[PDB]
Design a protein around this ligand. Structure first.
Ligand code: CL
Ligand code: ZN
Ligand code: ZN
Ligand code: ZN
Ligand code: ZN
Lengths: 275, 273
């Protein structure tokens, strides 16, 4: 099994990044990731070239295993997070990680391992790994855990997949700017699909989560709704207004994070609507 | 033994000066017979003796009884994608015990009360909008077996309640849910703490519920409130509260379609116990 060591990484998803490993689709790959915190740094291991993947494809990354350490780091301070125009100083706290819980002074927060940065090469230019758009990026979506498949739209040959910013746990919003940041080993399985998509999609056992990242949260919310209704309209071949009504009844619109240059909204679309 | 407010006695605004149509003591159960939102009427208001401005009214929702048929609607200028859509459309929905039916799809049932509120401090807010007193919050957590904490601004609170759904998605994106008339049995109590915004208390979580003209403001406010909520209850420094909300609190959306948009923050009880 191929291992991508943490020392091979990027600080931008760039159209022109060079690969540091090549895989056939169907292969498993271990990514060793450094924590996000270490201020010219938020590193994503990779990028990885996947044979035969073309622009307009969908790269599929199944998250098999996230191996976490026993210590984590959270940080906040002036100018950071949702109330950064209201907090002083710069603060950091070490956090103990047990098998089932992150410990926070007296508190046992249920563990919830997740990959916070995941993306591929964009169409043009470069986006820092600290932000996100259609190619993926710093989406801090907690749904990206073990036993899901992240679908990503492809813009460059080979996809050029990179990944990092693993958290031991997090709440939706990530309001202080950070979660429990940790270095990790993430075991993934990479496959391809020839269908084109606009924005990333996380497939869990019972839901599709469409994930939209734009500079203002209101716009991201409008976009993910537009994308959710169409999704349903195409898969069920029903009139748009019916899909719109169906999404009002069964789709849960939400928030991934409110703190990166691009804000991440999501929409849970249950598989029961198709099955 | 036992009080029933019929649906004919209702308001289309939460006003500071609306007259009660019934009175209750804390500890008593009341039944609100509601009409459907399609005018967005709230049965009441009920005067709760012994509740003063500055207190918190606690409304435990015991039962929501639903009919077997519901109504959903949308069209040009309605919902997130009013942009966007042409015409005007309505659809009857069959309601089974465990599911609302939609052209062969079984949407899991999830009974909820969409409008609930009290008299505001001054002026009037239509029952279709929302603010600190409650209103059209369309929060799917306001379900059976939860407690709604509402801030009080007038003597006796003046509680009203309407707009019941059989099921709903967070966001309510086309403007309407599965709209129905219903019976809602509640149990009213009082707390002598002042609060800023409504809070739904579930079995394992508190949900702070903020409603403002734009969702960005709503989201920032629910976050400010949530962090202060945690800071007081645990007597830890603000920055510790802030970090803890980042790890444990789930910020989300109630609805994006009413004139005030409603954000929420889930604060789990385990962080105190
Ligand atoms: Cl509050
Ligand atoms: Zn991140
Ligand atoms: Zn992070
Ligand atoms: Zn409503
Ligand atoms: Zn309604």
């Amino acid at each position: 099994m191929k291992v991508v060591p943490a020392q091979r990484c990027v600080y931008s998803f760039s159209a022109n990044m060079a690969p540091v490993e090549e895989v056939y689709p169907g292969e498993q790959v271990v990514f060793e990731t450094l924590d996000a915190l270490g201020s010219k740094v938020n590193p994503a291991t990779g990028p990885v070239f996947v044979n035969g993947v073309k622009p307009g494809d969908t790269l599929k990354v199944r998250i098999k295993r996230i191996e976490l350490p026993r210590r984590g780091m959270i940080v906040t301070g002036k100018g950071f997070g949702v109330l950064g125009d209201e907090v002083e100083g710069f603060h950091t706290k070490e956090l103990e990680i047990e098998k089932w819980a992150v410990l926070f002074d007296g508190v046992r927060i249920p563990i919830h391992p997740m990959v916070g940065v995941i993306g591929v090469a964009p169409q043009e230019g470069e986006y820092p790994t600290g932000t996100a758009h259609r190619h993926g990026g710093n989406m801090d979506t907690k749904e990206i855990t073990e036993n899901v498949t992240v679908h990503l739209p492809v813009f460059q040959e080979g996809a050029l997949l990179a990944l990092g910013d693993v958290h031991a746990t997090m709440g939706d919003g990530e309001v202080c700017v950070s979660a429990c940041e940790v270095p990790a080993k993430v075991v993934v399985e990479i496959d391809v699909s020839k269908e084109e998509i606009k924005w990333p999609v996380v497939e869990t056992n019972d839901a599709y989560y469409i994930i939209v990242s734009l500079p203002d949260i209101e716009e991201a919310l409008k976009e993910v709704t537009r994308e959710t209704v169409w999704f349903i309209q195409r898969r069920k071949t029903i009139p748009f207004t019916d899909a719109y009504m169906l999404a009002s009844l069964s789709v849960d619109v939400g928030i991934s994070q409110l703190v990166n240059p691009a804000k991440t909204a999501k929409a849970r679309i249950p598989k029961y609507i198709f099955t």
